[PDB]
Design a binder for this molecule. Structure first.
Ligand SMILES: [Zn+2]
Ligand SMILES: [Zn+2]
Lengths: 217, 97, 126, 25, 78, 108
């Protein structure tokens, strides 16, 4: 019975010590509890947006920490089965670092233009039998134009649980794991990407080890 | 996980209060093609070009004083029921050190 | 390739009922992963209407006790002239040190805080 | 208690924004 | 070499068509037949780059390498 | 292949062209289902027949839905909504009544 990979590692929360990779202090030190102006604030973003500091929204640190924990746990347990994670960042704020982290890990990124269907019509531009991404981590869903990334609709149109670093200008309508947080500060995105790299790397390492030990049975 | 109240209280962006006529010092977060977007915490970073008086010391990890003026920069134009953000600050530069 | 219409909200129940039907012969893999770690706010496809009339958004405005201290410091004396780093957490300098000293001396005053304010100002300036 | 955000009396209030006729008819 | 093909076209393959494409130009298709992208995945997907879903992964990978070289040079200093 | 596709509406919409003018076109709407609680509409149109049929079949099998049904006789309760202009007035009856409604609703 080599099917223990679908039971043993899933019967525990934060098995890879995901709660220790970050914390409330780690977020407070990176200025993640910030938000853009409250002018174009989204309706469904009000519960997350705790307060404001003169046209500057502030998000509760506990909610953001819990969302980060859940999203990282899900991403790790998905990579535990070669879960093809997909990054998105068209704002050009940290596309270089995001691509470098994706290279260091086994995930991929889609920080370029969305042509004639890259996920809904991936049978023509690519091969016929191509496993589509089972997870999308929107690093910067807000592109240069006043409009969120269109990949959310494509993901919803293909049954894909997506993660997103949502903010005040975002629209967490169909995101399965919204991650409220700041997107203007550089240290915030740096910490985000470092945590992602470490988490996915540890997930892949534990995957290899445990899968080998189980198949050896 | 320490105290959530103290951490939310004592923070740089909240400690600086309403940025207005505050000389802030910082470094450049990313070299620009022909500008000088110097960072300094807060909510946004200033925007300007290289000055004529000493314009080489500006490096990725330096310390140059700014002024911090209007960290929002927004204005409801005509029919736009919402705001039009620019993600800038625009402040008068002082010098080096 | 599964039910993807965003009319319900979450895809977990969609895939579950589809597998129960008989279409999806073999399950993917994320089933147990989602079963073990459910989300906080489920993406229930709700009409994202715009706040029109009295539909207000009770969003409290954050205001700390140091607001009055900073107001007094910048009204009596000049504006913020000290160089602030603001990169590393809880940075300290001269104006920040003065604000910290004021917070330490507040409350426990009752009598008059302007006296201690002027005392600290004169000690820092002379 | 004191380290939490509590709406105060709204400081940073500018006096009466007089235009030109501050007190000279 | 091409001497045999020339002799053949001159003797036992004189079409005479004015055009220059439909003429008898029999040649080893090892170089004439163009090539396209071979396999784009392997063991459980896994393309050849992290920009596979962006279409034309080679061009974008080259652009990212050029940007990395740009940043490295910046750090250093037809 | 287990899905049973059926034809529903076929209107003789006269679509414009250029050299001929008004040409008879068809708007296909296939319903993909196979009992047990499965059903799915379709979208698409063209001038041919089998082409539009298979296009609708594809667009339907793509966006499918398995209605959470109760048992092999009736759903759960009566639902009443107003989709723009239509009016839904369904009634839950036990064994001994029959499918008394529109032929299209009967097929659905
Ligand atoms: Zn922001
Ligand atoms: Zn007046």
């Amino acid at each position: 019975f080599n099917d223990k990979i679908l039971n043993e590692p899933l019967k525990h929360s934060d098995f890879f010590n995901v709660k220790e990779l970050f914390s409330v202090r780690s977020l407070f030190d990176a200025r993640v509890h910030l938000g853009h102006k409250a002018g174009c604030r989204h309706r469904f973003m009000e519960p997350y947006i705790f307060g404001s500091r003169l046209d500057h929204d502030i998000i509760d640190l506990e909610q953001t920490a819990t969302h980060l924990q859940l999203a990282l746990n899900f991403t790790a347990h998905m990579a535990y089965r070669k879960g093809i994670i997909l990054f998105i960042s068209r704002n050009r704020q940290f596309s270089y670092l995001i691509e470098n982290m994706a290279r260091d890990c086994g995930e991929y990124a889609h920080t370029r233009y969305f042509r004639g269907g890259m996920l809904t019509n991936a049978r023509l531009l690519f091969g016929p039998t191509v496993r589509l991404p089972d997870l999308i981590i929107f690093l910067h869903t807000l592109n240069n134009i006043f409009e969120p990334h269109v990949a959310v609709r494509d993901a919803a149109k293909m049954n894909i649980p997506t993660v997103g670093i949502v903010d005040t200008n975002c629209n967490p309508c169909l995101i399965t794991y919204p991650v409220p947080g700041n997107d203007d500060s550089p240290l915030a995105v740096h910490l985000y990407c470092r945590l992602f790299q470490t988490a996915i790397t540890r997930a892949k390492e534990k995957r290899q080890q445990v899968e080998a030990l189980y198949r050896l049975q | 996980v320490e105290s959530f109240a103290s951490m939310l209280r004592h923070s740089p962006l909240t400690q600086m209060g309403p940025a207005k006529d505050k000389l802030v010092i910082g470094r450049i977060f990313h070299i620009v093609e022909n500008d000088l977007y110097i960072d300094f915490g807060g909510k946004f970073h200033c925007v300007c070009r290289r000055p004529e008086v000493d314009g080489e010391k500006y490096q990725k990890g330096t310390r140059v004083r700014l002024r911090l003026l209007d960290l929002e920069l927004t204005s409801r134009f005509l029919g736009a029921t919402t705001d039009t953000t620019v993600l800038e600050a625009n402040a008068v530069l002082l010098g080096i050190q | 390739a599964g039910s993807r219409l965003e009319t319900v909200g979450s895809i977990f129940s969609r895939t579950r009922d589809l597998v129960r039907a008989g279409v999806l012969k073999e399950k993917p893999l994320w089933f147990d992963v989602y079963d073990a770690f459910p989300p906080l706010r489920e993406p229930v496809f709700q009409r994202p209407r715009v706040r029109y009339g009295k539909a207000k958004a009770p969003i409290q405005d954050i205001w700390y006790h140091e607001d009055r201290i900073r107001a007094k410091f910048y009204s009596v004396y000049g504006s913020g002239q000290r160089a602030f780093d603001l990169f590393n957490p809880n940075f300290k300098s001269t104006c920040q040190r003065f604000v910290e000293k004021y917070t330490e001396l507040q409350k426990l005053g009752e009598t008059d805080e302007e006296k201690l304010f002027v005392e600290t100002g004169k000690a820092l300036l002379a | 208690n004191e380290d939490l955000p509590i709406s105060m009396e709204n400081p940073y209030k500018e006096p009466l924004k007089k235009c030109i006729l501050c007190g000279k008819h | 070499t091409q001497e045999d093909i020339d002799r053949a076209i001159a003797y036992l393959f004189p079409s005479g068509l004015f055009e220059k494409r439909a003429r008898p130009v029999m040649k080893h298709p090892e170089q004439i037949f163009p090539r396209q992208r071979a396999i784009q995945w392997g063991e459980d997907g896994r393309p050849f780059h992290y920009l596979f879903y962006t279409g034309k992964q080679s061009y974008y990978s080259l652009m990212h390498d050029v940007y990395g070289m740009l940043l490295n040079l910046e750090k250093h200093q037809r | 292949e287990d899905f049973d596709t059926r034809i529903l509406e076929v209107r003789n919409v006269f679509t414009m062209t250029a050299k001929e003018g008004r040409k008879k076109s068809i708007r296909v709407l296939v319903a993909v289902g196979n009992g047990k609680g499965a059903a799915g509409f379709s979208i698409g149109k063209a001038t041919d027949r089998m082409d539009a049929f298979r296009k609708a079949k594809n667009r339907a099998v793509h966006h499918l839905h398995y209605i959470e049904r109760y048992e092999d006789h009736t759903i759960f309760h009566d639902i009443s909504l107003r989709f723009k202009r239509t009016h839904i007035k369904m009634k839950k009856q036990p064994k001994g009544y029959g499918l008394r409604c529109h032929r299209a609703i009967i097929t659905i």
